[PDB]
From a paper:
Unlike BGZP-C, BGO does not prevent recruitment of TGFBR2 to TGF-βs, thus to understand the potentiation mechanism, we wanted to gain structural information on how the BG:TGF-β complex engages with the signaling receptors. We therefore sought to stabilize the TGF-β dimer in a single conformation and prepared an alternative complex replacing TGF-β3 with TGF-β1 inTGF-β1:zfBGO:(TGFBR2)2. Cryo-EM analysis of both complexes yielded density that closely accommodated the component structures and enabled domain placement without ambiguity. Despite this, it was difficult to build molecular models due to strong preferential alignment of the particles. The positioning of zfBGO on TGF-β is responsible for the 1:1 stoichiometry as a significant clash between OD1 from both protomers would occur with a 2:1 stoichiometry. To confirm the direct potentiation mechanism, we conducted an SPR potentiation assay using both zfBGO and ratBGO. It was surprising to discover that in contrast to ratBGO, zfBGO, which we used for X-ray crystallography, did not potentiate the binding of TGF-β2 to TGFBR2. ratBGO and zfBGO share 55.4% sequence identity, with no obvious difference that we could identify to explain the observed effect. From the structure it was apparent that the most pronounced difference lay within the TGF-β binding loop of OD1, where there is a two-residue insertion in ratBGO compared to zfBGO that allows the BL in ratBGO to make additional contacts with TGFBR2. The two amino acid deletion occurring in zfBG completely impairs the direct, yet not indirect, potentiation of TGFBR2 binding and is also present in most other boney fish families.
Betaglycan (BG) is a transmembrane co-receptor of the transforming growth factor-β (TGF-β) family of signaling ligands. It functions by enabling binding of the three TGF-β isoforms to their signaling receptors and is additionally required for inhibin A (InhA) activity. BG is nonetheless essential in vivo, where it binds and potentiates the activity of the three TGF-β isoforms (TGF-β1, -β2 and -β3) by presenting them to their signaling receptors, TGF-β receptor type I (TGFBR1) and TGF-β receptor type II (TGFBR2)4. BG, and a homologous co-receptor of the TGF-β family known as endoglin (ENG) which potentiates the function of BMP9 and BMP10, are transmembrane proteins with a large (approximately 760 amino acids) extracellular region comprised of two domains: the membrane-distal orphan domain and the juxtamembrane zona pellucida (ZP) domain19,20.
Author numbering:
A (entry chain A), D (entry chain B): 1 to 112
B (entry chain C): 31 to 359
C (entry chain D): 47 to 153
E (entry chain E): 45 to 153
Write the structure that this text describes.
């Protein structure tokens, strides 16, 4: 539900999606990729408050535990919700081919 | 798709499942007594389906949460209105422990593994129908009762054998007393409205279940059990179905599919869990948590916009917590 | 780990009679069969400078030439005389043969 | 795999369920349920290196980025996968009722 | 209130505290009221042989034991003595959660 535009246009300290650029060669070592050389791979981060878009009841229970027990070292975490596929084109032998590296760019985040 | 009552043969059957007891009490004072006594005062239900066949009631015995293995002898005063076959499906109980089942005339005790039958004993006695009279008889023949429970007639009875320290040392039948250690599970049909737009397709099917409330007085998330098994026979089927589960409140959909194969698509606005039986037997796509529309027609149109059309069937159950899905051959 | 190899077709290289230069091949591809080794052929000539890089099985000759250097992990250019222009053939089986191109150990 | 038995028989620092006693009145502050007054909800905790049950390739991408760039603070988080409903008994008015509060017992933890 | 009050809902039973300035219901049942509108209600009757204490969820609008409830919005269960013949009758009502659990016959002093 929390799209990238919502947190990019307006900064929200809650669980959101933060900008981060990942290059295939230097970062991931995917030296077999032709194009793009890198891309923007936003990552989910941000503390989770009780009053926010939460789906799992366990996350709500753990958030309430933290509220009533601030020192617990166990709180719901900000993790990817919807991951966008990455369209790439490269060469197999001497034949061009276009593939879709599924779940490569973050588009949503969730507290769980 | 006119909202009309769902027929018996509909692939979606909506049932409400609840664990409850008519009354009962528990006592930890039987610790001194070398033998523990549990009373299950079954009461005949209003259902007319039990006329000739002798009702056979199973039993599920487990150690209490505070115990891992139970070895003390357990006496069961299983008074019933009519003779019953007691299929004692024990669990996590040490073998060789004597288990005296005081039962009404004509009632038999059957065990899954013979070791329990060889070690156990069955005594046939005539016992009063009244709960107070039965408790007095138990006190007279044993001097104490570990727990008493008046339950309506059911097919299974989950008992956690053991003396719970929370309960006092005295047992007093209280209509407001209810505990997890002694419960009887009941399931009954619930009203629903729906339609069938497309017939059974061997390629891919779309059955939509709409839920308004899980019949819970609180405002939290509870489990909604959806069963998926062949409509007829035990022959496994290779079929693909689409499940659009709508919950107005927060409800976690637990899907259990038995003897079904293929690919299953689940779309809902609430978290979904799948039993290992469904996971191994079928390939279920990872659902994306989407703010689905509201109303039968809106969800139907949304699904048609995703290509998962035509709708095999749509059904809506205002009040229930259990669903059964049956696949036509 | 991924193996990077030069798979550019017959192209022109600005390094002639040079000790070593860049791969001068922005195109990267994965070989059709796993056993294929990566072969670079250089035919520098006064009229023009032409080089190619492909990936193929060591057993099958390339341009009617026997590839006996496929056992070398790194691309080392062996010199063979050919009418018109000199021939420099290297074959590599190790990963990342595009790090540099070596024509002769001696400068 | 990463169930209660796996991480309770042996101590593993990676993503798994760890013991936690959830109390309604004290730890959670809930008083609308008569009992169970308290139960066990083993919570997901522990990081996952690159070589782990990373179902989504984006998690592998994050792990590789962290390994090559430790100063990123963008790594997969330990999240419950399958949660077991908890039975509860509580009174509404004068009527007792037994319900199944779903997704509050965490058994399986994945990384994402 | 969207969330109904969580009131101690033990019915008539014997009690140990009599006309105490502050007392606790000692009720082991903390039930969610059937409706949000109804609030916690506590009644305390004293006779020549025994004393009874009853805690329930009751609608303040509807009189209980022939007595209208005007302390519905009271954050604490403020106890009012009634003119019940013969026996001594006390009754308090409160809209807070588990508020009837704590009983104050007379907070004064």
């Amino acid at each position: 539900a929390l799209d990238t535009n919502y947190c990019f246009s307006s900064t929200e300290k809650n669980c959101c999606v933060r900008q981060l650029y990942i290059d295939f060669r230097k970062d991931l070592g995917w030296k077999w990729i032709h194009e793009p050389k890198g891309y923007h791979a936003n990552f989910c981060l941000g503390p989770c408050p009780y009053i926010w878009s939460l789906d799992t009841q366990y996350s709500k229970v753990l958030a309430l535990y933290n509220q009533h027990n601030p020192g617990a070292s166990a709180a719901p975490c900000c993790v990817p919700q919807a991951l966008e596929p990455l369209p790439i084109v490269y060469y197999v032998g001497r034949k061009p081919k276009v593939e879709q590296l599924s779940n490569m760019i973050v588009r949503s985040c969730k507290c769980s | 798709c006119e909202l009309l009552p769902v027929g018996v043969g509909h692939p979606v059957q909506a049932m409400l499942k609840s664990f409850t007891a008519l009354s009962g009490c528990a006592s930890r004072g039987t610790t001194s007594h070398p033998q523990e006594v549990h009373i299950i005062n079954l009461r005949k239900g209003s259902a007319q389906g039990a006329r000739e066949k002798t009702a056979e009631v199973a039993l599920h015995l487990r150690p209490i949460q505070s115990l891992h293995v139970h070895q003390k002898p357990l006496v069961f005063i299983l008074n019933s209105p009519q003779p019953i076959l007691w299929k004692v499906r024990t669990e996590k109980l040490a073998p060789g422990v004597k288990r005296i089942f005081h039962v009404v005339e004509g009632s038999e005790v059957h065990f899954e593994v013979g070791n329990f039958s060889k070690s156990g004993e069955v005594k046939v006695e005539t016992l009063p129908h009244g709960n107070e009279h039965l408790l007095n008889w138990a006190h007279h023949r044993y001097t104490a009762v570990t727990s008493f429970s008046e339950l309506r007639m059911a097919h299974d009875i989950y008992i956690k054998v053991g003396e719970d320290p929370v309960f006092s040392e005295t047992c007093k039948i209280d209509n407001k007393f209810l505990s997890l250690n002694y419960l009887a599970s009941y399931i009954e049909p619930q009203p629903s409205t729906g339609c069938v737009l497309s017939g059974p397709d061997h390629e891919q099917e779309v059955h939509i279940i709409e839920l308004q409330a899980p019949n819970s007085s609180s405002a939290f998330q509870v489990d909604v059990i959806v069963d998926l098994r062949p409509l007829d026979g035990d022959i496994p089927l290779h079929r693909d179905v689409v499940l659009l589960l709508k919950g107005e409140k927060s409800v976690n959909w637990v899907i259990k599919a038995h003897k079904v194969m293929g690919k299953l698509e689940i779309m809902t606005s609430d978290t979904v869990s799948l039993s290992e039986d469904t996971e191994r037997l079928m390939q279920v796509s990872k659902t994306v948590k989407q703010k689905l529309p509201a109303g039968s027609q809106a969800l139907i149109q949304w699904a048609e916009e995703n290509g998962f059309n035509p709708v095999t069937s749509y059904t809506n159950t205002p009040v229930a917590n259990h669903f059964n899905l049956r696949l036509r051959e | 780990f991924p193996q990077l190899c030069k798979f550019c077709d017959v192209r022109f290289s600005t390094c002639d009679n040079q000790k070593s230069c860049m791969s001068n091949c922005s195109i990267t591809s994965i070989c059709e069969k796993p056993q294929e080794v990566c072969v670079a052929v250089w035919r520098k000539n006064d009229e023009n400078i032409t080089l190619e890089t492909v990936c193929h099985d060591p057993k099958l000759p390339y341009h009617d030439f026997i590839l006996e250097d496929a056992a070398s992990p790194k691309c080392i250019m062996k010199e063979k005389k050919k009418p018109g222009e000199t021939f420099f053939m290297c074959s590599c089986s190790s990963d990342e043969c595009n790090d540099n191109i070596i024509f002769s150990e001696e400068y």
